[PDB]
Every structure is written in C-alpha cells, then in structure tokens.
Write a protein that binds this ligand. Structure first.
Ligand SMILES: Nc1ncnc2c1ncn2[C@@H]1O[C@H](COP(=O)(O)OP(=O)(O)OP(=O)(O)O)[C@@H](O)[C@H]1O
Ligand SMILES: Nc1ncnc2c1ncn2[C@@H]1O[C@H](COP(=O)(O)OP(=O)(O)OP(=O)(O)O)[C@@H](O)[C@H]1O
Ligand code: NA
Ligand code: NA
Lengths: 537, 220, 50
RNA sequence: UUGAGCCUUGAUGUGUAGGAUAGGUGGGAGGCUUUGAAGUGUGGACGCCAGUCUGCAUGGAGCCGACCUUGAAAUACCACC
C-alpha cells in the first residue's frame, strides 16, 4: 500500500534550502507528474529517489527488490560508443548476478563441495523473480519496439534519436519505478503519440517531469508542486492545478503584504520619541527584532525574468540563397535539389520528423559542412546568433559569469555599454552565485544562460534549434513576445504547436526523399495548405 | 451441462478433513479421461519478495503414471553411460543442442555436476521453464544414477507461482485412495522441511485436491 | 556563513572520518583525498559523506 | 441506497508473429455439445474500435486441441486468485 516513502527530508546546498521538511508517497501503478518553476529542484529529487546523492537530514525507505532506473534531462557525454553499447550500460547492477552464474560453474567444474554446491543458491537467489537470462535478446528486443538499429555509432544520431536511446537504456532493466526527467524534448508528434501508449500500458509506476501542457493532461494520475522547499499535491485534472495553485499564490501574496504592513509601522515606532518618563516596552522591541530577522525568508514570486534583444544594423536584403543544392547522407537523402531564398525580416520555422536534417540544414547555411552540390551564398552584413540543439557553446566547468559574455565584464545593454554583471539580475541570477560552474546549473537555467548571451550581442540573425526545450511557460511567454517583435531574420526549429503560431509566418515542412515543401502561415495554416496540396500534376 | 450438475455436487466453500474427501472428490470421475490430477495447496509467503521464494526436490514411490525421458547434459562424455541408464538421449556437451535440434531441451534437467562444458545454450532458451540444475533444488550432481534413479524414483519439481501456490502431479486418480493420503504426507513434511526462512501467520494457507477437468475439495 | 560542514568517510571499511568544510555552491565535485587511517594504519582514499 | 472488507456467483488481461485483445502456474490430451449449432439478428455494455462477451424468439447437434510461423500457447474445472 506504499512503494517509496520519504519523511522529514532536508536538502540544502551551500545556499537556501532546496528541500524543507517534506514528504512523499508512491503507490502501485500511478503516473505522478512534478510541476515546478525553473531551478526549483525537480531533478535533484529524482537523484534522491534514484539513490544518487544527498538527503542529509531525512530517511528514505523503499522496499528491497525495487529496481529503480531513471532518465536524465541533459543528453549524456559518453557519446563516442555505439547504440547497443550505450543501451547495454543500463544493466550495470544486473551485470553481476548475470556473470557469477557462468563464473562459479568453474568451482563446480571440480568436485561438488559446500563452497561450490551452495553457490547455485546464491547467484540464482535473485534469478527467481527477475529474468536475467536474456540480457541480449531483450536489449535487441526493445529496439524492434522502438526503431533504433543496434550497431550504429551513437555519436551520430540526431537529438531526437539520442533522446530515444536514453529512454531505452533506462528501461532495459525493466524497473518497477520509472523516473522520467523531461521525457518529451526532441521528439516529434509521432514519437510523442506512440510514447503516450507505451507508458500507459507500462506495468510499474511512473514519476515524470514534463513541461508539455498537453502531455500532462493525457497522463497524470496525481500532480505534485515542489514550489519553494515544500511540495504539496493536488486532485483533479491538470487545469484544476493551475486554478488551485493560483489561489495559493494569491493568498500567499495577500498575507505577505500584510506582514510587511505591520513591520512597516513597527519601524516608525522604534525611532519615535519616548516622551516624558516612559520605557518603550521591550516586549515589542524584541518582537520587531524577530520581525526583522524573519525577513530572511523566501521571495514568493521567483521574478518573471526580464529580457531584451540587441538589434543591429539591417542585413542585406538576401540572407540565404541556395538553389540546386542537394546534400545526402550515405543511406538516405536529407535535402534533394533544394531551391529557396530567405529575405530580410522573414521568419521561418523548420518542422518535420525526427532526424530529417533540420539541424544539418542550418549547418549548411553557416557552412559548417559542405554541400554535395548546388552552392550556397550567404548574406552580406549578417551578425548570426546561434542556439544549438545540444548547447555545446558553454564549457560546463567555466564559471557562470565568464560563460555569459565570454569571460569579460561590461555587457552592452540597450543603447551603450554602461552595464556589467547586472545583466544577471534581469535573468534572476543572484549576484552571490556568479562563480558557480555551469555544470551545476539546472537544465532550464543553462538554457536561459545560453539564451542570455545571444541577446547580449548585436545580431541581424537568429538560428534556434529547439530554444524552448527546458523553459517554463512563464519564461517561454516572454520569448514568444521577444522573437515576434524582433526586426531581423529568424530561422527557428521547434516540435511544439502553440509556440510557432505566435512567432513565425512561414514553414519549411520536411518530407521524405530530401524534399522540402515551403508553406505560408503559422504552423496550423501551413498544415492546412498541406491537406489541400495537389502538387502541380 | 455436467458442470451444471457437478456445481451442486460439490460445496467447495466448506471445510473438510484429510479423509472425509476421498470419496467426496471421486464422484466427479464419471468422465472418460486420463484424469491428470492437479492438486492445489495455497501457501502463505510474501510471494513478491525474492528471499521467501522456494523451489523443491522430492521423491515419491507411487509415481505419476507417466514417466519423463529427460536427457543429461555434460561436456564430452557426460551422456555416454547415463544415456542408457535413465535418459532418452545422452546430450553431448560439445553438441548441446545436437541431440535435440528441434527440442533444444529435454523433459528433465541435465546432470553433469562435475562437467561445466556449457552454461547451456548461451541464450536462456535452455531455461525456458527453469531447467538449469542448481544446488538449491539439488539438480546438479555428477552422479548419473542420481538422475538415473529419478526414473526409478520419480523426481518431481516444485513451482512458485507468482501468487505462491505449488502444483504437482500426484499419481492420477487411477490409483487408490490411501496412496493419496500417503502422497500428501510425503509432500507435507518434505515441504515443511522445504519451508524458507521468512514467514508470517500460518504457513500452509489451504490445501485442495483437483484436476485440470475435475472439481476439488478443501482437504485440510 | 556559506560554507557547510562535511565528513570524509574512509574507503578502508574501518569506521573513521575526518571532518571539514566545503563551499558547496561553487564546488559541485566531491573531494577525494588520501589521508591516514589510524585503525588500519595505512594511507587510504577518503571520500565525502554526510 | 448509500461508503470498507469478505464468500462465491458473473465479465475483465491488445507489446508483435498469428487463427486473435493472447493473465501466472497449471497438467493434459482430446473434450464440449446436443437441456439441442454453425447462424439470424438483438440489447444495455465494450473500442487503445481489428472485436470478445450474453439475455430475446425463428432455426438449434457442429465447431474445436492437432503443425506451432512466437519471449509464454490455446475462452478446455477450479486453487487466496
Ligand atoms: N551539485 C550541486 N551543487 C550545488 N548546487 C546545485 C547542485 N545541483 C543543483 N544545484 C542547484 O540547486 C538547484 C537544483 O537544481 P535542479 O537541477 O535540481 O533544478 P530543476 O528544478 O530540475 O530545474 P529545471 O526546471 O531547470 O530542470 C538549482 O538552483 C541548482 O543551481
Ligand atoms: N555526425 C553525424 N554522423 C553521421 N550521421 C549523422 C551525423 N549527424 C547527423 N547524422 C544523421 O543525419 C540525419 C539528420 O540528422 P540531424 O541532426 O540533422 O537531425 P534533425 O533533422 O535536426 O532531427 P531531430 O529533430 O531528431 O534532431 C540523421 O539520419 C542522423 O542520423
Ligand atoms: Na537535430
Ligand atoms: Na533540471
């Protein structure tokens, strides 16, 4: 009647407490979703349950025999292996019961002794409940269920496929507890549609953190906050939580102002004149001392991080022109005889299926890799701002301050360079935590930091390979307004629907066989023309 | 039909004794069949833990009325003398699947306690039902006569169903009614002797004697 | 008072630990220092803990 | 007429191959069925829609296990289930 329990937990890095006195309850066959603002600690909870770190003052009590494996939020760095190799390393704990049974037949290759006869009990002690016999006919099984081929070097797959491999390596062990940190990041609609049935049928229990407001509704039995060191649950469908949470925020805003009201009028009284022979009760001076001390508390609004772009001089009227360009990877064609133009102030959305060449198409435009034929001509006064799929432009060890604005002070903001390191306060970075290595930051925090230093330099051009992977809707809402009003050219890549109906006016819908169909309008308008296509018989 | 007649003929909700059921259970035997007995004992264990899972080895004189011709696997000549002494085939270790190309595994386990010529098929296909001989149930022993004596002694394996119920053949109803009581006493203490460490409350939850197509009675 | 106290439990099995401080918001890595273990009287590797 | 446990009586169980929505362990070979089918439609129900479940009367005694082409095979008692 309970699966994982956590009572009186505490986690506090050299900072304000990530986890206060908090509690959790995991039942049989439930899909629980964690919903918290960026940098709030959803991933660190996943590392606590997965038996990975921390929990200084608290007790975790989960039953033995409970196999737990999780899916991380950031793509791995052991990328230089192969797909079957990377997926295999998810059975590391199972690799010991597997290997002893074949090993300790050598002791029984000799005469049967107590040390050799009693062994078969030990290695097969775990074997009764698990399968453990086919950890090669299951790893190759899941791919036929998923689609990956096992012997393709994994340092090659796309962002969507690389994410798929990390969802398999966390599922080879067949865990009773599935912890999915950001499952739908670089997937297409087909993969997301299929995954919504894989997880529903899944026999065990699922805990997942998703920023998809449409994935959560289809699969969320219960929902959990983890707001500011305390986590509280909620009943009902997903839209209920938004309503109940807003009341929690409004009331807490209402009581927060009232406390300041008392403390405001208790500081006019401390410096008032005494009068004639009176004492100024210290039952009120000490209470004011306790009120001033209590102001070292949590700031209920995280702060709606504010941003602004750095417009530069207008680019040439032609940004990209490529005709007769036809680039094809060894097996299949990614782009076959392209012919298109990108003009000034044209906002283009690249959409399509997984691994269809969206990321490599941008690489052709910037000349990262050479076209097989056809030639590409680039604009003449371009100031490119580049947002890769995998960030890859921040070393995880360099400090937060140095990665932002390339290890220099004196950011340029708005008009003239009269700003330094205050550019963090616009992004709700506390100025104390400015020497933190970038690897320590959360996924969404790292997304914004790379976003911050692109809007930090003059630019006539934006290339965004899924810029809104980890951002929450409150921060994503600003990005929709910023990119919309941007005067220069914008080519953005995204796998969600609502976001491209407010920023883009054209689409380059990908098709098989290296064919790209260019439609007009937002996402929904372009898909509308694609039903009514007649393809010029 | 007969199920509608027989459903009144038994009162399985009730409780009975070790002997007031032998005639009570044979009344359903009107049907012409081999009557493959499916005795059922409900066990009390936290079945979905690992440590309490138990698997048993037994010997019974009455047999089951249908012996098993199970090959023996040993690297080299582990089947060159035991094949004629209690095996349908002598499965050579160097040709582990050779004697059983179609049926990679025999009916019974392979007794090569001194021979480690193969873990067995390398792919778990030789463990489809748990045929790998282990010292927990004493299936591994270099003495072929131990497995060879299985045919002359009727070796029967136990099963730990995912709810924790052991099923075994009894020596189908064809035989007498006192031999059933002898059979139960054999499986009673020898399974009490087979009880694992952890337990709670009672150990043997319920007892019943039944068949694939035969009604049952709560023995107790 | 940013720094937080920690202890280095020995890998040599013998229950033993040195204690120290660590700036946890600028040092995500976990210390691993070689120091004396008087129970086993050898220099072993001490890894971080609570 | 309402909320928890039992005791049965009824139905639920789709990764795919495939006969098709296919629960563990059964242990089997042949049962059922004629108190009368394959069917005819009926009615609430079911869909993850390819169906599988039973009233209702006309007709009502023919279908299955069998070879496996699978991780595990046959709606073919009952065992806390
Ligand atoms: N090893 C660490 N050392 C110090 N501080 C850390 C460490 N790991 C995380 N933090 C900080 O503590 C908080 C926990 O970050 P975490 O990755 O858990 O956030 P999150 O809620 O998962 O974020 P996101 O919504 O962006 O995915 C963040 O503010 C982060 O900067
Ligand atoms: N370094 C590489 N070596 C070999 N093949 C590669 C390499 N990078 C990409 N590919 C292949 O090129 C194709 C397109 O990859 P790309 O990164 O452009 O995908 P994408 O269209 O952006 O898709 P997604 O949305 O899944 O990231 C895929 O078949 C991918 O496997
Ligand atoms: Na990509
Ligand atoms: Na995170």
């Amino acid at each position: 009647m309970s699966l994982i329990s956590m009572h009186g937990a505490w986690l506090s890095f050299s900072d304000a407490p990530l986890l206060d006195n908090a509690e959790l309850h995991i039942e049989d066959n439930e899909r629980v979703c964690l919903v918290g603002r960026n940098g709030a600690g959803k991933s660190t909870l996943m590392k606590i349950l997965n038996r990975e770190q921390g929990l200084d003052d608290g007790r975790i009590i989960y039953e033995q025999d409970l196999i737990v494996a999780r899916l991380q939020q950031d793509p791995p760095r052991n990328v230089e292996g192969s797909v079957y190799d990377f997926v295999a390393e998810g059975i590391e704990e199972q690799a010991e019961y597997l290997k002893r049974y074949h090993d300790i037949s050598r002791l029984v290759m000799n005469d049967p002794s107590e040390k050799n006869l009693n062994e078969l009990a030990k290695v097969q002690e775990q074997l009764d409940h698990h399968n453990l016999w086919q950890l090669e006919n299951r790893i190759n099984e899941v791919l036929a269920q998923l689609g990956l081929d096992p012997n393709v070097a994994l340092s090659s797959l796309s962002g969507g496929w690389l994410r798929k491999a990390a969802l398999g390596r966390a599922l080879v062990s067949n865990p009773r507890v599935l912890l999915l940190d950001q499952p739908t990041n670089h997937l297409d609609i087909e993969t997301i549609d299929w995954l919504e049935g894989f997880l529903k049928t899944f026999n065990g229990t699922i805990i997942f953190i998703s920023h998809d407001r449409s994935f959560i509704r289809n699969m969320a039995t219960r929902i959990v906050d983890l707001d500011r060191g305390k986590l509280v649950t909620y009943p009902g469908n997903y839209d209920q939580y938004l309503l109940e949470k807003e009341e929690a925020l409004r009331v807490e805003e209402l009581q927060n102002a009232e406390f300041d009201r008392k403390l405001a009028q208790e500081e006019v009284w401390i410096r008032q004149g005494i009068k004639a022979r009176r004492t100024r009760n210290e039952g009120r001076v000490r209470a004011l001392k306790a009120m001033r001390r209590e102001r070292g508390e949590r700031r209920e609004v995280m702060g709606t991080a504010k941003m602004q772009v750095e417009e530069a001089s207008r680019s040439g009227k032609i940004v990209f022109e490529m005709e007769d360009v036809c680039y094809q990877v060894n097996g299949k064609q990614l782009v076959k005889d392209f012919s298109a133009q990108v003009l000034r102030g044209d906002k283009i959305a690249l959409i399509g299926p997984n691994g269809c060449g969206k990321t490599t198409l941008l690489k052709l435009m910037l000349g990262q890799l050479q076209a097989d034929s056809g030639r590409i001509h680039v604009g003449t006064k371009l100031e490119v701002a580049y947002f890769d799929q995998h960030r890859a432009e921040l070393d995880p060890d360099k400090t937060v301050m140095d990665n932002l604005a390339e290890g220099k002070q004196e950011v340029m903001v708005n008009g003239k360079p009269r700003h330094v390191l205050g550019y963090l306060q616009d992004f709700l970075f506390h100025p104390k935590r400015a020497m933190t290595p970038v690897r320590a930051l959360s996924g969404g925090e790292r997304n914004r930091l790379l976003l911050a230093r692109l809007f930090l330099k003059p630019s006539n051009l934006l290339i965004l390979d899924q810029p809104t992977n980890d951002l929450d809707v409150e921060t994503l809402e600003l990005l929709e307004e910023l990119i919309d009003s941007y005067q220069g050219t914008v080519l953005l890549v995204s796998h969600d629907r609502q976001f491209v109906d407010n920023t883009v006016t054209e689409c380059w819908i990908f098709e098989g066989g290296g064919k790209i169909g260019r439609y007009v309008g937002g996402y929904h308008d372009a898909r509308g023309q694609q039903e009514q296509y007649v393809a010029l018989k | 039909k007969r199920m509608r007649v027989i459903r009144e003929k038994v009162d399985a909700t009730k409780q009975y004794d070790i002997n007031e059921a032998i005639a009570l259970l044979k009344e359903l035997a009107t049907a012409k069949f081999v009557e493959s007995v499916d005795v059922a004992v409900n066990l009390g264990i936290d079945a979905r833990k690992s440590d309490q899972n138990v698997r048993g080895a037994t010997v019974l004189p009455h047999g089951t009325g249908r012996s098993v011709r199970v090959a023996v696997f040993t690297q080299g000549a582990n089947a060159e003398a035991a094949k004629a002494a209690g095996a349908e085939l002598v499965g050579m270790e160097d040709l582990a699947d050779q004697i059983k190309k179609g049926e990679m595994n025999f009916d019974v386990v392979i007794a090569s306690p001194d021979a480690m010529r193969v873990v067995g098929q390398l792919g778990q296909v030789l463990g489809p039902r748990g045929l790998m001989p282990n010292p927990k149930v004493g299936t591994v022993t270099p003495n072929v006569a131990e497995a060879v004596k299985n045919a002359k002694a009727g070796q029967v394996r136990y099963r730990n169903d995912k709810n924790g119920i052991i099923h075994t053949t009894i020596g189908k109803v064809d035989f007498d009614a006192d031999k059933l009581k002898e059979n139960l006493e054999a499986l009673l203490v020898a399974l009490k002797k087979a009880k694992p460490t952890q337990a709670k409350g009672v150990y043997i939850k319920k007892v019943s004697i039944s068949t694939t197509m035969g009604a049952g009675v709560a023995v107790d | 008072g940013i720094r937080e106290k920690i202890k280095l439990v020995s890998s040599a099995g013998t229950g033993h630990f040195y204690t120290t401080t660590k700036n946890k918001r600028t040092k995500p890595e976990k210390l691993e220092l070689k120091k004396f273990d008087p129970v086993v009287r050898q220099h072993v590797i001490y890894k971080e803990a609570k």
